[PDB]
Structures are given as C-alpha cells and as structure tokens.
Design a protein around this nucleic acid. Structure first.
Lengths: 109, 82, 96, 92, 92, 109, 97, 81
DNA sequence: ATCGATGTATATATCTGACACGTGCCTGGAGACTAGGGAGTAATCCCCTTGGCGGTTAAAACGCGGGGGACAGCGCGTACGTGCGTTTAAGCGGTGCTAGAGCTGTCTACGACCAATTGAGCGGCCTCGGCACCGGGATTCTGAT
DNA sequence: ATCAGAATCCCGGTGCCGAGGCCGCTCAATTGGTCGTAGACAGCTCTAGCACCGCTTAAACGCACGTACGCGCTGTCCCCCGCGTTTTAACCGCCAAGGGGATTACTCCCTAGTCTCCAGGCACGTGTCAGATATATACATCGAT
C-alpha cells in the first residue's frame, strides 16, 4: 500500500508551498515542461525574500513601539534598505506614506 | 451629467500634497498646472482600465482593471490584488 | 504670530509622518466618474477601484512634487513654479 | 477557492519575529509582493528558455533569472537559499 | 537558414514608394521594429487571455491589445485595417 | 484537391499570415490560437510598416535621395508624434539626433 | 578674423547634429569594454558586432543625458553645463548615483 | 588592461556634448561623464555576460547585448540579425 | 539670557473591533508506473576571433591670451503666508431597489492533429546605377571698421 | 553700411561596391478529414452599487496685512574658448593560428499523464487584547525683548 504522503515543502525544508508553485508554473504558459527542481528553487527564493522584508518591517515596528506590522512599516523597511528599494523602486505601497525628508537649504537659518 | 469636477481638487489639498513632497513655498500659478497634470494622468489610467472592462464584457470597473492599467504604465500598485 | 515658514515646516513634518489620503473622497469620485464618461457611458465602479485610483494619483503627485522641489532648489529658489513642474516632467519623459 | 500566501507568510513571520503580528492590509501588501516576484522570475526564466531553444524550465533558468533580477547581495543570498533547498530536496 | 521580414517589407515599400529603394542597414532596423511590435502585441494578448480565464487568443484579444498598445490615431487606423482584413478573409 | 491559396492573398495582405500563425503557436502565448488572430496581427503589422516606410521615403526624397537609410527612419519616427510615442524608448543604430538648438544659446541680434 | 567664443561651438553643434557617425574612437572603447568585462568572467571573447552594439547604446545614452543636462543648465540661467546639472538630471531620471 | 577609462578623451566628450546641443562645458564635466559611462557600461556588460554564461558560451554575441539592453528598458534596433 | 504662548510628548485608563486560534470537509497535492522524446555528450569542421607589425597621418595634447560668463552683493516691489470670521459641503448612518456579476448546464462550432503535396522563399551569383569623393566657381556669413 | 577672408553650397565627372534581379530546390504552408472540448448563450441567485435624506462640524473660502523673497542690475575675476605646434596612437592591411560555435548522432533518464487516496488549507465562528481616544500635564520651541 501507499507510504504516508510527505509534502515537497517539508522535503526541501521550506515553509512556502512547492506544489502550488509547481502548479502555477505549469499553468502560466511559461514553457512546455517544468523541471523537478524549479519549483523548489523558486519557493526557496520567494521565502527568503519574504523573510528579509518581514524582518526589516518587524524592526521598524519595534522601533515605533508597535507589536503589529502595518503598510507604513513595510514602506519604511523597503525605502530605508538600499537593495530592497532598488528591487521595489517602481512600486507604490498603498497607505505606505513617504520617508520623512526635508532639504537642508529649506531649514531655518 | 458632471461638469467642472477638477475644481474639486482644491488649493488646500494641492498644498497638502506638496507638503508631503517637502515643498516649502508654493507659487500661485501651481494649482492650475497641477490640476492639468492630474487630469492627464487620470485620463490615461482610466482609458486603459475601461479598455480592460470592455474586453471582459463587464459594465463595472473593478480594482483589478485599475491595477492592470497601472501595471502596464510602469506604476505597479500593491495592496489591491485581493 | 509665527514667522512665514515655521507653520510650513510644521505642516511638512506632520504630513510626512502620516499616511492618510490628502484629497477629499467625494470630489475625487465625481472627477473619476466625469472623466470615464468620455470613454463609456453608464459605467459602474467598485469602491475599491476608486480607492486604487486615488492611491495611485496621490502617490504620483507627491513624487512629482519631490522632483519639482529639486528643480526649484537647483535655480536657487525656495518657491516652486510651473517651470519647475515642466522641467521635471520633461526630464521624466512625460507628455507635455 | 481564493488561494493566497497568507498562511505561509504568517509562518515566515512567526519564524523571524515570534512576538510580532501583522494587519490584514499589510498581509495584502505581502501577497502582492509575492505574486509580483513570482511573475518577474517566471517571465525571465521563460525568456531564457526561449532564447536557448529549450522547452523545459529547470533550476538553472531560475538561478539565472534570479541573478538577472535581484541586485547585488540580494542575488547572492537568494542563490544560496535556492541551491541549499534543491540539494536538500534531492536527498529527500 | 535565418528567417526575416525583408521580402514583405520590400513589397510594402514598393506599394507605398515605387521608385524608392532601401539599404540593408535600414532593412535590419525594419526587421527589428516588426519583431518588437509583434512581441509587444502577442504579450499583451496573452495577458488578456490569462486575465479572463480563456485558453484561446482570437482576433478580439489582438484588437484589445492594439487598443492598449498603440497611441491615439494609430490605434484607430490599425483596428480598421485589422477588421477589414478579417472581414475579407472570412468572406473568401 | 484545389489549387492552394496563401492565407495572405485571401486577406489581401503582403505580410505572411502563415508565418505569423506559426510564430504565435511556437511563442508560448496561449494553449490555442483562433483563425482570425494571425490575419488581424499581420494586417496591423503591415499597416505600421507602411506608415513608417511612407514617412521615411518622404524624408529621403526631401534630401534628394532615392534609398532609405537609418537616418531617414530616425527622422521619420522623431518627427511624427504618434510614432515617437510608440518608439519612445527605442534607439535606432546609426540614426543620429534631430537638429535642435535651444533658442537661448543662439547669438544675440 | 578670430571668431568670437561660441561661434565655433555653434558650428560644431550644427555639424555633429547633422551627422550620424560614432564619436568615440573604436580601439579605446574596445579596450574599455574588455577591461570592464574581465571583472565578471576571465578569458572572455567578443563578437565585433557585440562591441559595435555596446558603443551605439553608450553613445546614444550619453547624448540623451547631455540633452537633459543642457536643459537643467538653462533652467538655472546658465549656458555652461556643470556636474550639478548632470547629477540633477540623473536624479530626476531615477538612475543611481 | 589598466587605465582605459582615460581613452574616452576630452575631445570625444566634447563631441558627444555638441551632438546633445551643449554650447559651453565646465572643466569638471569630463570626470563626471567618465564615471557615468563606466556605471552604464558595467550594468550592461554584467547582464550580457550572465546571458553568455547561461548558454555555456565563451563569446559575447550581439544578441546578448541586445537582450541586456532590452531588459534595462534601452531597446536597440539594427543588431538583431 | 528670558518669559510668554503653545503645539507637542509623556502617563494612565477604557473599550471595541480586528486579529489569532479552532473545526469540518473537500479538493488539490502526493505516490506509483509507463512511454517517449528532450537533453546531455562526444566527435568534427571550419570560420571568426585574437595577436603582431609597419606606416602615416589625423587627432590628441599642450600652451597661451583674452573676453565673456559665473557669481556675489544690493535694492525694491509684489506676491505669498498667516490669521480670523463665515459659509459650504463632505462624511456618516440608514433605507430601498434594481443592474449585473457570478455560477451552472447544454450544445455546437472551431481548433488541434495527421498525412500528402506543391509552390514560396531562401541562398548564391552577377551586374550596373546610386552615392560618395574631388575640384573648382559662387554665395554666405562673420567680425572689425 | 563696408569689405576682407573662412566656411559652405552647388555643379559636374568618376568609380566602386551594394542593392536588386534571376534560378534551383527543399521544406514550410495548405488542404482535407476527424473528433474532442472551449466557449457562447440562456437562466437563476443575491450581492453591491447607486440614489436620496437629514444632521453636524470640519474644511474651504474670502479678506486684510506684512515682509520675505524673486528678480533685475552692477562689478569682478577667473576659467573656459580659439588657435598654433608637437607628439602619439588609431586605423588599415596583411598574415597566422587555434579556439570554440554550430551540427549530427546516439542514449538514457526525466517529465507528462492517469489513477487512487488522503490530509492540507480554506469559510465560519468567536473571544480577548493592541491600539486609538480621552484627559491631564510636563516641556521643549518660537520669537520678540
């Protein structure tokens, strides 16, 4: 009889769903065929990026003394990080606000 | 049915937008120029969104139509995809 | 009575801390419905669609004002003028 | 059946910040970000397969697409994570 | 053996300017333009089919992609040309 | 079996309907392709080609030339508002620039 | 019959806006391309058309940048372009310093 | 090998500025222009070499450069064949 | 310095509505097996990339004088900011009603697939005309007078 | 206005090399038949988008007044331009070599497709606690003295 089912996410040591990513790759018209390791690699990359953003946003929330992450903390995390800002440069975070910035020449004498 | 609605973007609202942009002093001719710029931007986004709505045989513009219209203008928007 | 510029700096600090929409909702909704009449008649709108349009428009205008402020400071001025907006939009590649 | 990434994003947040919660609006932002990055990597990998007259998308195409899209130090660590995951998966 | 659009570009040129020739470098520019526009329109049509949960790209998707990608009066005349061609094709 | 006709001749076009259909099938664009989509796409491509070629030929004639070179294509594209809007982010190799001097730099009097 | 300052500059503007040839010498640009590429992969070969395409893209990009820099200089009531003008133009474009 | 960025000479930069319509050039412009060109070239060449390495080739082709420019929004016409 | 007005930062309590956890089931993911064709690998060939050398001439580099352009300082007049009293309409809560989005079922037209055929398009060869280059005369334009 | 001299335009003659035409052949487009399912259309559910009313109060509006700032003008000096002379290196052609890109053939192992099974993940429900609001109050900041 069948062995106990083991999720491909658990095999690869991941939190993000490998099977769902595989299904999305197969149905997106990206190619005729999808290799076995492509969903694993993609899920790992997506999980890593999510972890980086969540860590920066959690730090921004803690500095604000808040225990919840809101879009403002995500915007602060993205705009204050050079690489994340470079990756998400053309993106608008809804209710994210702006970085507080005043030109020096505009400051009082 | 609707006329002169661009005046609804009042001078204090434009001032608030410029304050968020860090502007300190604003010329009096800025307000009409800003209204024209906003109208052009809105016209281009709404045109693409309505094209998406018409393609789907729908009579209602959804947030996904607006998101796709923005996406195709290089202005990706987060937080409205679900 | 505060000197000119103190209240402006306080307003800049206040509006750069917050994240709420700075344009009133009903006038913007009326503008959106008026603009869309030229493309299709009897068009309905999801409320989230109008909210998405407002978020996009306000972000676009705030970014434009940042670039305009840079152009104004380049000409050794503290006042933004229509020529600053025109220069910023021209350097961005936007339609005149 | 409206699928999303909220449960996996929540698990990742609990891994990196066990004390910290997230609002639903910020979760929507996270879902949009995940979908966007998926679209970018998948499109670049598809273009890479088409450029080389291949019909299969393998982990090489994913790695090259990640190298093309992610800047600087982000690309290095993402490549490391993907390689580690593939190696672990290949060993069951 | 490398396929290009040179013979159809030359036919179109002879229709619009009977006495005018074209250099090889300009032909290369024209081939790049044709390939670029084809890719733009096909990508937009594929996205339109994906958005509406359809598996077929038809002339309706091409028309919508043209209305999305071409500016102003270019879109009107291109749409008219496409409609006239399809009408002639189906009648024959 | 009848005398075979090209689909381009049926649609009254100079651009190849069959090649466009094959490029759409090879493309990874959709699972299926309708019968009118290649015809519509070929007609649109032919119309755009004719527009650019007519403008470039006019530019060449205005220079007393009988052969179109990349310079004439650049002059045609940059002088037409719609084409300039469509080809805004495009670099024409060996095309040059539009002659344009800022009026403030012109000699006084 | 010495020409006044600015006459020869205007003549050069006319001449170089009328023409389409490349303005950077090919052999120094090829050396620059090979030197830069060495930092990504050693023992790299280049097709001649590859270097030609790179040079075309580079010259086009720099000419467009100089146009935007000229506009920035005219905005500040000057006729001389300065590094601040290039920096402002690149900043408004959204390019990285 | 070594000091190649100085091969982009002052007269060459003047020619590029003249095609851009510039009438007068400050003396500090040449170094800034050299830095700008170096950054642009580094980005494009990095992308092109990634494309070359994926194909397991040792030779950079014009198609690699065209793809690298395309993915930076700098589409180039006239080298695709 | 210095005190006054005042918008802002800090401390504590209340509550409410949104986040975090629990449950059922169903529908998407996993395991097993087979076929076949995509891709990896080895050998080959020939083309195209790299290296070297000599000359010769156009371009780059250098030096120098000067004039024109950048920049700082000053004056002035006007246009923007700030504050106050009035008015306008945005926001909110509630109700009613219907357009239309979403889902399901039926059925047929349409597009994939396959095999055979032929004509369109490709690659190679040859030639002759468009374009470039040169030289000399005519016109324009610039700068000092 | 004048007039000398450099730059440019025009007109003609020569030549060369690339565009354009022609021919063989092969392989991609076309035709005809079959069949499976995608999508077009009809019908039903019930969500949510629109319209309207009344109240409240915050925001917008209009006006007055002062001064901060934009802008024009002038003076200075330095640093860019124009030009002549010397140096240097790019470019062109010619020759050699071998590296690696493209192609073909062979094999096998990796992925799609089908079927069965089951446990993950999503709609629904609900409680409790994070942050907003309220109030009091310290306190740093502006700004005229």
């Amino acid at each position: 009889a069948r062995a106990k089912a083991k999720t491909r996410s658990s095999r690869a040591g991941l939190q993000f769903p490998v099977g769902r990513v595989h299904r999305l790759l197969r149905k997106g018209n990206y190619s005729e065929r999808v290799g076995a390791g492509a969903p694993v690699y993609l899920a790992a990359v997506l999980e890593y990026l999510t972890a980086e953003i969540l860590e920066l946003a959690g730090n921004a929330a803690r500095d604000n003394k808040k225990t919840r992450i809101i879009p403002r903390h995500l915007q602060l995390a993205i705009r204050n990080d050079e690489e994340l800002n470079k990756l998400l440069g053309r993106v608008t975070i809804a209710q994210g606000g702006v970085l507080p910035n005043i030109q020096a020449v505009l400051l009082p004498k | 049915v609707l006329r002169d609605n661009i005046q609804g973007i009042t001078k204090p609202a434009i001032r608030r937008l410029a304050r968020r942009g860090g502007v300190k002093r604003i010329s009096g001719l800025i307000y009409e120029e800003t209204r024209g710029v906003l109208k052009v931007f809105l016209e281009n986004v709404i045109r693409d969104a309505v094209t998406y709505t018409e393609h789907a045989k729908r009579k209602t513009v959804t947030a996904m139509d607006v998101v796709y219209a923005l996406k195709r203008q290089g202005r990706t928007l987060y937080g409205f995809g679900g | 009575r505060y000197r000119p510029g103190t209240v402006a700096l306080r307003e800049i600090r206040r509006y750069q801390k917050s994240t709420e929409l700075l344009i009133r909702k009903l006038p913007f909704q009326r503008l959106v419905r008026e603009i869309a009449q030229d493309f299709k008649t009897d068009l309905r709108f999801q409320s989230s669609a109008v909210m998405a349009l407002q978020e996009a428009c306000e972000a676009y205008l705030v970014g434009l004002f940042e670039d305009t402020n840079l152009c104004a400071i380049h000409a050794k001025r503290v006042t933004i003028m229509p020529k600053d907006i025109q220069l910023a939009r021209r350097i961005r590649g936007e339609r005149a | 059946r409206k699928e999303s990434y909220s449960i996996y994003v929540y698990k990742v947040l609990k891994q990196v910040h066990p004390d910290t919660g997230i609002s639903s609006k910020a979760m929507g932002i996270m879902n949009s970000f995940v979908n966007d990055i998926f679209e970018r990597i998948a499109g670049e990998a598809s273009r890479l397969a088409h450029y080389n007259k291949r019909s299969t998308i393998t982990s090489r195409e994913i790695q090259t697409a990640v190298r093309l899209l992610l800047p600087g130090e982000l690309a290095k660590h993402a490549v490391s994570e993907g390689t580690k995951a593939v190696t672990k998966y290949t060993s069951a």
